[PDB]
């Protein structure tokens, strides 16, 4: 049987690492914040079926992040004024 | 056209053909019209005890018409003439999972059974 905690902590690192590669400021900052907030919000779920559902949703969203980071790199643009100062 | 149950009657055809219209033990039903897009020919062969021992069909029509008439042809075999008279359009539709826009196909297939049985009955009066 797979370890839910190991999947969860591996997915957390992977999703945060991949989200930091978003070229666009608003997708990058949102994805990192949202991932941090969602895993913390769901920290104390105890039902193994519900945990599994959340893990499966995270795996789906990691696929979305990977593809959309790549697409955003192929069609990138200039940085925002606040990324300078 | 899409339903696995309907397409099966085309991809895996059974009882397509003809029987001898001159036989006193053959009933032929020809129903529908080319201008309406659906023509079914159903023939039955009846033994001397009144049991339907074989049947054949040909159909011009959409996949659901081919499946409805093909299923009717399978279903009449082994039935007496009186038994086959009780096959209903609604049983054919249920078996094939026909949507409402194709229910007229199961009605025509029932009409084909009854026309074939009626033709056979006409031949027995002498």
């Amino acid at each position: 049987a797979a370890s839910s905690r190991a999947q969860v902590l591996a997915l957390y690192r992977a999703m945060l690492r991949e989200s930091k590669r978003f070229s666009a400021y608003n997708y990058r900052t949102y994805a990192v914040r949202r991932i941090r907030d969602a895993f913390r919000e769901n920290k104390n779920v105890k039902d193994p079926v519900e945990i599994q559902t959340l893990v499966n949703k995270a795996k789906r969203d990691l696929g979305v992040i990977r593809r959309q980071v790549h697409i955003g790199q192929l069609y990138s643009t200039d940085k925002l004024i606040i990324e300078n100062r | 056209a899409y339903h696995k149950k309907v397409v099966d009657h085309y991809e895996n055809p059974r009882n397509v053909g003809s029987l001898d219209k001159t036989s006193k033990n053959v009933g032929t039903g020809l129903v529908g019209a080319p201008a309406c897009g659906d023509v079914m020919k159903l023939q039955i062969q009846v033994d001397e005890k009144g049991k339907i021992v074989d049947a054949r069909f040909k159909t011009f029509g959409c996949g659901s018409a081919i499946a409805s008439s093909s299923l009717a042809t399978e279903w009449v075999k082994g039935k007496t003439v009186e038994e086959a008279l009780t096959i209903k359009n609604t049983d054919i539709a249920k078996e094939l999972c026909l949507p409402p826009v194709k229910l007229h196909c199961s009605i025509l297939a029932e009409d084909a059974i009854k026309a074939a049985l009626a033709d056979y009955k006409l031949k027995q009066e002498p």
């Binding site: 608003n26 994805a31 949202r34 992040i65 959309q68 004024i81 606040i82 | 899409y2």
Partner: protein, 395 residues
């Protein structure tokens, strides 16, 4: 060069990456016409369209059969207003709306007045909210439709949609709401709110431009005369090819919003309070347009006295904002804003992807440039020398 911050979400939103991800397969290999009934490209496109229909229905509490896809909330507003008016025109010739509705509702009503219909444009209070008792009084025996928008696109104020539904249901008058700025933002439930028709825009909820929907209640059955003639797509209510990738994007945006609404509202509320409080504690003579007690926090409309709004937008050269904007403002006039202050109002939008850093930058630049433009303003000079502007004979 470096790009400005986007603080203009009531005009349009970026696509959510989850929405573009859902759309891409339909722009690459699932390109079938959802109305092609005889092959797998059609079947798969139809199935994606019907899944998206269920996603829209789930967000608003509807049955999927009540969801009709359109090209945008402009089209949905035309269908609801002209479609109901024309259907019941043999018995009913009166419609009610408000003075602060979006231009597509107002101009649809104007077109019907030229068709011989009677339209009451209700006034609003200084809060921007309608008077429910004035609405009740305006309903006539031949009133076919009341149309009142859920969230205002310029000032962000929330109309009492459930209470209006109570009024309309009890009199058997159809109730339409333009929910383009509310859908996926505040809770909407068509049965609890007693809504008969609702307009939805995909590009106001992180979905693609060029798509929308109209909810048309099926029980009790609401009848609408279709406007776009054709082969009878969308149950005869909106003929034409349903654009599979765009409706997939609309359904995905609705499902994402259903999941993110509470999180976004908490986050956007905090950023909105921060923006309003930090500007007001640092500048005198700043007024919020619209009642903060009945207001969606992501749309903030402020007036900066003695500064003209377009010059402030020019000064805020690295922030994308808008002024006297429809997603001299007729909405500001309707809430009784002095004409000069209405020339001094700016709209700030805070959305799902806005950061605290962007809010703080915008606040800091607004404070700096309002002070600069006041130091350039003859009206500020006159008030600083104790002159009452209301005593000058102008021109």
């Amino acid at each position: 060069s470096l790009r400005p911050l986007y603080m203009d979400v009531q005009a349009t939103t970026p696509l959510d990456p989850r929405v573009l991800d859902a759309m891409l397969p339909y722009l690459i290999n699932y390109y079938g016409n959802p109305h092609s009934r005889t092959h797998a490209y059609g079947w798969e496109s139809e199935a994606a369209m019907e899944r998206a229909r269920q996603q829209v229905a789930s967000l608003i509490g509807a049955d999927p059969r009540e969801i009709i896809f359109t090209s945008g909330a402009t089209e949905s507003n035309n269908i609801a207003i002209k479609g109901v008016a024309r259907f019941y025109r043999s018995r009913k010739k009166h419609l009610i709306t408000t003075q602060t509705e979006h231009k597509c509702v107002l101009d649809s009503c104007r077109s019907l007045e030229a068709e011989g219909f009677q339209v009451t444009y209700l006034p609003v209070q200084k809060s921007g909210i309608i008077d429910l008792k004035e609405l009740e009084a305006a309903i006539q025996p031949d009133t076919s439709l009341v149309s009142v928008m859920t969230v205002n696109n310029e000032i962000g104020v929330k109309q009492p949609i459930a209470e209006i539904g109570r009024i309309c249901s009890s009199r058997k008058v159809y109730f339409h709401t333009d929910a383009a700025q509310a859908v996926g933002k505040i809770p909407l439930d068509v049965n609890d709110m007693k809504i008969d028709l609702m307009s939805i825009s995909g590009h106001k909820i992180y979905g693609p431009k060029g798509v929308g929907a109209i909810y048309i209640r099926r029980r009790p059955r609401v009848r609408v005369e279709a406007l776009q003639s054709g082969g009878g797509q969308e149950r005869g209510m909106r003929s034409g090819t349903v654009p599979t990738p765009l409706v997939v994007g609309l359904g995905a945006a609705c499902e994402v919003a259903q999941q993110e609404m509470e999180y976004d509202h908490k986050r956007i509320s905090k950023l909105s309070e921060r923006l309003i409080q930090n500007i007001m504690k640092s500048l005198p003579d700043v007024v919020m347009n619209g009642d903060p007690k009945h207001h969606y926090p992501g749309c903030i409309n402020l007036s900066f006295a003695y500064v003209e709004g377009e010059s402030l937008l020019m000064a805020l050269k690295d922030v994308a904002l808008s002024s006297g904007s429809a997603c001299p403002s007729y909405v500001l006039r309707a809430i009784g804003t002095d004409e000069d202050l209405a020339h001094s109002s700016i709209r700030f939008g805070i959305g799902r992807f806005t950061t605290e850093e962007e809010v703080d930058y915008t606040v800091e630049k607004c404070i700096q440039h309002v002070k600069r433009l006041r130091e350039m303003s003859p009206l500020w000079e006159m008030v600083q020398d104790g002159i009452d502007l209301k005593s000058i004979k102008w021109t």
